[PDB]
């Protein structure tokens, strides 16, 4: 059963592509393994977690409401909106958004949310005021998935966001409340099951949330481990394949059974 930085290695050869990843101890935020951590990748549907940060960073400073009930419309909603397309009548709340961001991988909801915030600009903007100064978001959805090959809009590095998952999930960026409701949106993930959840024993906990995006790019950001209580960060990109998305998601899926088996590891 491969180690993890040889499936990593072996991923690449598989997908004629590039392969990026990192795993953190969760609690200490040391690196305990990398490939390509500094390399540049798009984030995709991945950045909906870092949004839902912002918004709860707002929420937290009284800026906005959970609560909140925000009206659309038809000319609103874009692809691969399954919640928001079944509420115009109704409207969705603030916290409705962040889930069908975050869970259901809701592009419209991710429109809607940048624009509490005021664009992807402002997105930026709160990473760079918590220490993440690679991540960068341009783009609304879908434009932000086109994945151009070396282009570095709409990108992170791995260790960029590795990091800054562990700061939204553990730190004090946010409250203890808003911690909590963020990882109990990304346990509540409907949309990554062929990924890394596709390796995980009984009795584990994951928090995550996958994407997919042009030029064959996957990726997924995740806090994980066994006994119900996640003890390290993983984050994985891969950007440029010809493959299948069933090919890539095995990629991704084999590098989680690589990690799962050797976790026990001193």
Known sequence: HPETLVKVKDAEDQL??????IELDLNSGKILESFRPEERFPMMSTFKVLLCGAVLSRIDAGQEQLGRRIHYSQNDLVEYSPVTEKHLTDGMTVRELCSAAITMSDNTAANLLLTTIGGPKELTAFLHNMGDHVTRLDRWEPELNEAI????????????????????????????????????????????????????????????????????????????????????????????????????????AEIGASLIKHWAAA
Do not use: C, H
């Open 149 to 252: 090959p070396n282009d570095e809009r709409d990108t992170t590095m791995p260790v960029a966001m590795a990091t800054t998952l562990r700061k939204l999930l553990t730190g004090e960026l946010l409250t203890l409340a808003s911690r909590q409701q963020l990882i109990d949106w990304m346990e509540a993930d409907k949309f990554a099951g062929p990924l890394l959840r596709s390796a995980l024993p009984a009795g584990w906990f994951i928090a995550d949330k996958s994407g997919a995006g042009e030029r064959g790019s996957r990726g997924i950001i995740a806090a994980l481990g066994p006994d119900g209580k996640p003890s390290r960060i993983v984050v994985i990109y891969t950007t440029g394949s010809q493959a299948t998305m069933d090919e890539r998601n095995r990629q991704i």
């Open 16 to 21: 004629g592509a590039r392969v990026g990843y």
